[PDB]
Amino acid sequence: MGSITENTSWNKEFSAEAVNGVFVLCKSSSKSCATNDLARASKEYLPAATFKIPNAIIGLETGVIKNEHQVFKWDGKPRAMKQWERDLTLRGAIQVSAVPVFQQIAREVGEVRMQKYLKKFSYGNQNISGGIDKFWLEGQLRISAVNQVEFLESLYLNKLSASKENQLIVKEALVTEAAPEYLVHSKTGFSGVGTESNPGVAWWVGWVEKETEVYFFAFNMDIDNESKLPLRKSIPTKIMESEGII
Amino acid sequence: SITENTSWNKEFSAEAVNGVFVLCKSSSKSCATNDLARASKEYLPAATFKIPNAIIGLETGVIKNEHQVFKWDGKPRAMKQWERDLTLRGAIQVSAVPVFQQIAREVGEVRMQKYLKKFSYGNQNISGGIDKFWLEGQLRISAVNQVEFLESLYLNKLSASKENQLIVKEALVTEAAPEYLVHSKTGFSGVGTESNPGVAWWVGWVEKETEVYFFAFNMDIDNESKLPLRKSIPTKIMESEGII
């Protein structure tokens, strides 16, 4: 992206909902971005499940994921959500955001390989200390909403340090909503409800392919109350509906 | 093998529609149909040919890559929705015939023929005009053949880079949900003439859970108003089988 501008009027939705948060929306053809808050747009947060994006990419590249037709066989042990207690494809694993699958991918990737790809991808603060299967969840990895849109735009252009086919595979895995007139590729994130003072963070990042334009977006909010969670989709949607995008 | 499923003709009787549905679970070695004779009968592909045409355009460099924009020259096009710049998915999704006609002209007769031979695409007959053999020419393809072709595409087994196959596959996404993804393309030759009906198509595949279902539907049609039956009849069979 080439420019960012602040549209304070985009705080209407956040205020309406009593939410501390940011939305960044960028247009590929002008390489220009808008946000409600420049400051929060550059603040860095645990990526949570948004990290499945780079992790899918590295697992593909390293051959820890064979190809897009890979089945992740459920062994039969209880998992944190009923949604995960089944065999899964990559898209499947991504869409039901199955943590144990990507924890296992992270473990086959390994500290060394994981660490390298994040430097090539310029992925946030690139800090994977705090457990190879835990670092994006409760460790010290941080990424900003601006850095998310930049990572995603590189993905969209196949300009990440991976094979073109592996980037394509992951973009298809990210398809979340399809219509004749638009295609949405997106991924949610939720680190937890936080603790004393210190709230968790919820994310929604992706892009919308519409007419011959592409809108990249990244949303995060502070969250202490798990019921406020759906706002990670409804607030960006409101802003993107306002803009006549979707 | 192809096996008749007797209960499927029910949907065809109800709308007074001669057509065929072919459905394959996992691979094309085990497919089911309402009619064994009609399953392998060959019809004009119409806009289902945008599939091989898109792959060929990519393979030949005619379409530079996935972000190619097909610019509208400003000249009259047969549908208002085609009168605009379009991306590859865009052109596939509104079925922009002129985008694909120009694709075909640049590919040229010699290359077009070679790729259809390579892909085993129907009778591989491109006679009738480089920019219209699939519309009104001598090109014919069966439901069974569509399913075979889509299976090769799905498996990245066509004679084309995997990257190009992936590109066309994402252009075909038509419905997305956490548990399933549908890639599909409609076709419609037209309404035909006295005693010679046109054909309507819905073909593609559903990736659901850990399984893949390949489908091809066609029907004889002499009335544009009957056109939504090309989606509803097959959706009604796939819904009954718990697939969508």
Side-chain angles (χ1 to χ4, degrees):
Chain A
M1 291 311 290
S3 83
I4 194 159
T5 177
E6 200 187 46
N7 188 167
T8 66
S9 69
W10 279 12
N11 288 329
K12 170 212 172 162
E13 284 312 324
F14 295 94
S15 292
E17 301 292 29
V19 170
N20 291 133
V22 57
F23 188 53
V24 176
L25 179 65
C26 317
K27 228 159 88 188
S28 196
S29 55
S30 53
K31 275 167 61 61
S32 74
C33 299
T35 180
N36 56 311
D37 203 273
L38 287 171
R40 197 174 163 112
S42 304
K43 291 190 188 199
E44 296 157 47
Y45 305 91
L46 272 160
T50 63
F51 187 77
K52 279 176 185 69
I53 301 175
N55 205 199
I57 298 175
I58 308 159
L60 275 160
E61 206 55 22
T62 59
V64 167
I65 307 179
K66 274 153 48 52
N67 61 5
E68 70 274 22
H69 293 140
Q70 256 253 193
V71 165
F72 300 90
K73 314 262 289 182
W74 176 47
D75 51 42
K77 280 81 177 185
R79 292 187 177 180
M81 281 284 88
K82 188 197 60 59
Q83 213 172 190
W84 306 340
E85 296 183 10
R86 73 177 61 165
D87 293 26
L88 296 154
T89 69
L90 186 63
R91 184 178 179 270
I94 285 172
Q95 299 288 307
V96 302
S97 220
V99 166
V101 178
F102 283 72
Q103 280 188 299
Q104 186 58 15
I105 297 153
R107 280 191 304 271
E108 336 258 44
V109 173
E111 203 86 293
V112 172
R113 301 207 272 180
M114 190 75 81
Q115 166 67 102
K116 174 166 85 78
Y117 281 92
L118 307 193
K119 219 286 173 82
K120 280 177 209 274
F121 299 166
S122 305
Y123 194 85
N125 70 354
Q126 300 158 215
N127 182 155
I128 64 163
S129 61
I132 189 60
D133 56 6
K134 297 184 179 175
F135 67 76
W136 67 93
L137 294 158
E138 61 181 74
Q140 308 314 334
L141 184 63
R142 299 297 184 272
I143 191 167
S144 81
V146 175
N147 184 187
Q148 291 271 20
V149 293
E150 282 161 339
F151 173 73
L152 295 174
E153 190 199 356
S154 300
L155 181 62
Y156 175 86
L157 296 177
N158 310 312
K159 273 164 85 134
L160 288 187
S161 272
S163 61
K164 184 166 172 165
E165 52 170 49
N166 290 324
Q167 299 183 65
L168 290 172
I169 285 164
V170 172
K171 296 180 284 186
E172 177 159 285
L174 294 164
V175 174
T176 49
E177 173 178 9
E181 295 296 311
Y182 63 84
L183 195 57
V184 185
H185 297 72
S186 72
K187 183 78 204 67
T188 47
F190 176 51
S191 71
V193 300
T195 46
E196 195 64 317
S197 287
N198 299 108
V201 64
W203 281 97
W204 199 37
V205 314
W207 69 92
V208 177
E209 279 147 23
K210 193 206 148 187
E211 160 205 61
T212 56
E213 185 67 75
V214 193
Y215 303 93
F216 301 93
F217 71 87
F219 175 96
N220 65 64
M221 64 183 279
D222 292 340
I223 189 175
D224 76 87
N225 185 337
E226 201 167 34
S227 87
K228 301 293 89 155
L229 195 49
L231 297 172
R232 71 179 167 182
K233 300 183 109 156
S234 54
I235 296 166
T237 309
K238 289 314 250 69
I239 299 175
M240 288 194 284
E241 281 178 5
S242 84
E243 291 287 313
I245 280 64
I246 42 168
Chain B
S1 94
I2 320 288
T3 299
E4 269 184 22
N5 191 314
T6 55
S7 75
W8 289 6
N9 277 300
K10 191 259 107 92
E11 322 291 331
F12 294 89
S13 306
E15 308 275 10
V17 157
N18 291 326
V20 73
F21 189 50
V22 177
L23 186 57
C24 321
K25 182 186 206 278
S26 308
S27 78
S28 61
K29 77 179 277 277
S30 43
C31 295
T33 189
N34 60 298
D35 200 62
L36 294 168
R38 196 169 170 119
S40 293
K41 208 106 98 179
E42 299 187 340
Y43 302 91
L44 244 4
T48 71
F49 187 76
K50 295 190 173 60
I51 303 170
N53 206 2
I55 303 161
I56 301 168
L58 282 162
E59 281 300 300
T60 50
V62 165
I63 307 174
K64 189 201 185 204
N65 54 49
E66 64 188 289
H67 311 121
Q68 170 88 62
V69 168
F70 302 90
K71 282 187 152 95
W72 181 46
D73 53 17
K75 294 201 215 285
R77 289 177 168 183
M79 306 193 91
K80 273 287 153 313
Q81 68 178 350
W82 305 334
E83 290 180 351
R84 56 168 171 235
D85 302 344
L86 291 161
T87 72
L88 184 57
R89 181 152 185 290
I92 292 178
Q93 301 291 321
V94 305
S95 210
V97 178
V99 172
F100 283 86
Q101 297 178 296
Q102 189 60 39
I103 290 171
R105 288 173 194 120
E106 294 185 21
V107 161
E109 293 84 342
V110 171
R111 296 192 283 195
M112 187 67 72
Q113 182 73 88
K114 175 178 75 197
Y115 281 93
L116 294 200
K117 203 168 281 43
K118 276 181 188 163
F119 292 165
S120 282
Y121 194 86
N123 63 2
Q124 305 156 40
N125 195 154
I126 59 154
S127 167
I130 192 58
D131 65 352
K132 68 212 209 292
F133 57 88
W134 70 93
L135 303 173
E136 63 175 289
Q138 301 302 283
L139 191 51
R140 306 279 185 282
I141 185 163
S142 62
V144 168
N145 201 155
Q146 291 265 20
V147 153
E148 292 180 330
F149 174 80
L150 294 166
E151 185 198 29
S152 303
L153 185 51
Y154 175 71
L155 296 171
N156 309 299
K157 288 182 157 308
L158 296 172
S159 287
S161 78
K162 166 158 167 189
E163 135 191 334
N164 286 344
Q165 287 182 91
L166 289 165
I167 292 174
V168 174
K169 284 188 286 200
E170 190 169 82
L172 294 156
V173 185
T174 56
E175 196 203 317
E179 351 86 66
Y180 69 90
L181 195 62
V182 177
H183 296 70
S184 77
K185 186 81 200 47
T186 44
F188 165 53
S189 74
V191 303
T193 54
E194 165 110 73
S195 319
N196 284 86
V199 64
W201 289 96
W202 195 40
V203 300
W205 70 92
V206 184
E207 280 133 19
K208 179 152 183 297
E209 302 291 278
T210 51
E211 181 73 82
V212 59
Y213 302 86
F214 306 98
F215 69 85
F217 172 93
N218 65 63
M219 60 177 280
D220 297 338
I221 176 166
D222 60 23
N223 191 353
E224 193 158 65
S225 85
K226 288 296 190 69
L227 204 56
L229 302 165
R230 79 178 170 180
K231 283 204 145 168
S232 65
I233 296 178
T235 304
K236 273 189 180 84
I237 302 172
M238 296 186 276
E239 276 174 4
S240 77
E241 316 282 283
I243 302 160
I244 48 192

